[PDB]
Amino acid sequence: IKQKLETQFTCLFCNHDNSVVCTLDKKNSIGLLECKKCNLSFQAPINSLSQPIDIYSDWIDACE
Amino acid sequence: EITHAISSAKEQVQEIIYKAQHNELELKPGMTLRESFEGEVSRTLNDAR
Amino acid sequence: IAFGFADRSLPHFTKDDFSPESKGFVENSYLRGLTPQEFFFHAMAGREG
Amino acid sequence: SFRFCLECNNMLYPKEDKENQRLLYSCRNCDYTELAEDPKVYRHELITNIGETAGIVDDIGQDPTLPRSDKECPECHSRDCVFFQSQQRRKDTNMTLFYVCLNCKKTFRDE
Amino acid sequence: VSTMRDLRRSGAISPEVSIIRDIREREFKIFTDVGRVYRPLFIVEDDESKDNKGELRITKEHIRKIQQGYDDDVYGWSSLVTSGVIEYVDGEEEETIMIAMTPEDLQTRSLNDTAKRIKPEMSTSSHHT
Amino acid sequence: TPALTVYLDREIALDIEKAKVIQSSIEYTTLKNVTSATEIYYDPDPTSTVIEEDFDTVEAYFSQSPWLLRLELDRARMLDKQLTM
Amino acid sequence: DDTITTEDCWTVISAFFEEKGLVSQQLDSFDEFMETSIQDLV
Amino acid sequence: DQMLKRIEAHMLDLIALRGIPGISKVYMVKHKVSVPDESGEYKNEELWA
Amino acid sequence: IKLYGREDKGTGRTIKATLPYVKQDIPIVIVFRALGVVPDGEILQHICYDENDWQMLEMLKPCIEEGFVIQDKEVALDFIGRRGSAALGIRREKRIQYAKDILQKELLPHITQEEGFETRKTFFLGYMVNRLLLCALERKDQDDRDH
Numbered sequence A: 001i002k003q004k005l006e007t008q009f010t011c012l013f014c015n016h017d018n019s020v021v022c023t024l025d026k027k028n029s030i031g032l033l034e035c036k037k038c039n040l041s042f043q044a045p046i047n048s049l050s051q052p053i054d055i056y057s058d059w060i061d062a063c064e
Numbered sequence B: 001e002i003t004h005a006i007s008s009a010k011e012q013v014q015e016i017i018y019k020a021q022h023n024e025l026e027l028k029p030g031m032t033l034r035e036s037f038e039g040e041v042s043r044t045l046n047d048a049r
Numbered sequence C: 001i002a003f004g005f006a007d008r009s010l011p012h013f014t015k016d017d018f019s020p021e022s023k024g025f026v027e028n029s030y031l032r033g034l035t036p037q038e039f040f041f042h043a044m045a046g047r048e049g
Numbered sequence D: 001s002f003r004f005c006l007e008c009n010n011m012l013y014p015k016e017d018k019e020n021q022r023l024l025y026s027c028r029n030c031d032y033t034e035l036a037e038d039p040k041v042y043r044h045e046l047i048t049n050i051g052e053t054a055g056i057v058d059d060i061g062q063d064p065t066l067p068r069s070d071k072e073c074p075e076c077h078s079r080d081c082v083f084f085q086s087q088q089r090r091k092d093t094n095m096t097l098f099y100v101c102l103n104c105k106k107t108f109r110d111e
Numbered sequence E: 001v002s003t004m005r006d007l008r009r010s011g012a013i014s015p016e017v018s019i020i021r022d023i024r025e026r027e028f029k030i031f032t033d034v035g036r037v038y039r040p041l042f043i044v045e046d047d048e049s050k051d052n053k054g055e056l057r058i059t060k061e062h063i064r065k066i067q068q069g070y071d072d073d074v075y076g077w078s079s080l081v082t083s084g085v086i087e088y089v090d091g092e093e094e095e096t097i098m099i100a101m102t103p104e105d106l107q108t109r110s111l112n113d114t115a116k117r118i119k120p121e122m123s124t125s126s127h128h129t
Numbered sequence F: 001t002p003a004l005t006v007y008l009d010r011e012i013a014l015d016i017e018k019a020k021v022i023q024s025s026i027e028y029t030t031l032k033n034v035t036s037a038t039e040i041y042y043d044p045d046p047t048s049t050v051i052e053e054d055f056d057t058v059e060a061y062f063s064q065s066p067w068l069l070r071l072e073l074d075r076a077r078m079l080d081k082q083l084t085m
Numbered sequence G: 001d002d003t004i005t006t007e008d009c010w011t012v013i014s015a016f017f018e019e020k021g022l023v024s025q026q027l028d029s030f031d032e033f034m035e036t037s038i039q040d041l042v
Numbered sequence H: 001d002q003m004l005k006r007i008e009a010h011m012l013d014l015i016a017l018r019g020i021p022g023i024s025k026v027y028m029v030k031h032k033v034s035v036p037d038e039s040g041e042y043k044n045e046e047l048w049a
Numbered sequence I: 001i002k003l004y005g006r007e008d009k010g011t012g013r014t015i016k017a018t019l020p021y022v023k024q025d026i027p028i029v030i031v032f033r034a035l036g037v038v039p040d041g042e043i044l045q046h047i048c049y050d051e052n053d054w055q056m057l058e059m060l061k062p063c064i065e066e067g068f069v070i071q072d073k074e075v076a077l078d079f080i081g082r083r084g085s086a087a088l089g090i091r092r093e094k095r096i097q098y099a100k101d102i103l104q105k106e107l108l109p110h111i112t113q114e115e116g117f118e119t120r121k122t123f124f125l126g127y128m129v130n131r132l133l134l135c136a137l138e139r140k141d142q143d144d145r146d147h
Ligand SMILES: [Zn+2]
Pocket: A011, A012, A013, A014, A015, A016, A019, A035, A036, A037, A038, A039, A040
């Protein structure tokens, strides 16, 4: 079951807080993120030990 | 009289231990080896007292 | 009386003694007066009560 | 008794060899695989009697607190040695005292 | 462990430091913290290379001296501890020591009074050290 | 302290053996009790086994994935509960 | 070296108490604190 | 390979051979009860339970 | 150190450690790797001093099973730092050193705080887990909290 998490993470690009959703897709070991203002999304494989913090950190690293 | 009664009770407990050591003491239903062993020795000592 | 120490009640006896005195049988009566270990065991019982 | 590779040090996963009908032991961080000497894979039991004699040490005799007995030693035939019961904390442990000598320290029972 | 205990009794180690030896664990611990609890005990000679085995290290000489208050070539309890007859012990160290209730037990006894306490049987170890 | 007091039949209440049978019936002994060991042997050949513990027995009894789930049982438990393997 | 009587033990205990006393632990702890502890904290 | 172990676990547990579910153990308790007799008196009668 | 799992409930008996200044537990193998012993052979030999005790091997095996996504010091440390109870967005730049700090210090401080002495910390962790399992094997009694 996909969970849509409106986590308190801020978006780097759109200068808005709480405009980031770090969705979880463990079925195919995939990461999804939805933004609310600039609507940007990040994709990355995720394992059993990965968590929205890990996805957010990997997103930050990718953006930089 | 009472001293010899105490000696007899102590001897009974001695032999009970000697048997329980050797896996020859009967196992009381519903209780394990140690628990039945303790219950028996306690009954013996209370009775001697 | 539990084996609070390593495999015995009080350090004075050797390890793994199951005899009455070795686990809390006060042999004498008050008039005779208890021996030290037995006095300690009696103290345990009284505190528990 | 699970083991690893001698160059990768990761554990070996038993993966079936469909083609040759043989069991292999292949790691995952490397391509190092070897033969399977015994078809055993996983072995679990409910009636366990292991650990009774696993508590054997050589420094037991010198300890004064260890009791002293009168039983005969089949190896040394001495008359000054100690004894002890199993160190199993399971609720099904018995009172079979593991008599021990001071030269061979053989665990034998006086039943 | 033997030599360390010797060093402590000689005074070359602070007595409150405890030399605990664990056999069934094959471990050997020592402690020097603040807040441990300890009590003294006589040192019964136990090495089977002399008559004194099974006999107290302390001797009438020491009692006479302590009465005097000055040793003959202030001689107090500290002199006793440092001289090799008394050493402190804590609960943890107590874990692995066999004690005689009184000096009398240090010698095996041989009666049957009707109005006095009776000693424990203590028959589970036919040999005592 | 969950506990039941079960009254037996008048005939069985005075009958020790039928009381034993009834008790054995009610007693909720599951296969976990009887089992003694569980070992997974990889038997590549469905037609036979490479293990001497039952090779003769399975072969005499004879006349898919090869993974085999082999479990042992304790004779005492089965005989005491009177149920056979 | 004859047997050590009970009065010998009482002698030893009297010497002990005279050296240390009753509240020796309180005073030893406090004096050690004043001599060393405070300085090391700073 | 893991599925075989999972089957092994589910087997060791979720199979019931005999007896009502929820009965760890049963005791062959003996009982004594007052029972009326032919003459009208009440007589003891040992009964299993 | 908490021995998670129940009897045929909780699936494998995973061991998840608790560390200071964190909001979530960590598997034992991960902390083994993040402290210098990344390979499994060193890890098992340090934890285990009774090879014949197959029960230890199979009971720590689930940790090995889940301890394969991490294979080096760095992702292990970031995993640790990714749950460092710190701010959000310390990135792999400073988060790795945050993890290295929280591991060198704040952990077993009574042993040491300098670098190049992780051998002591790993040996101590191994002893701790060995004792914990032995208690989990009921080969010795749990220490009496009133002792
Ligand atoms: Zn945005």
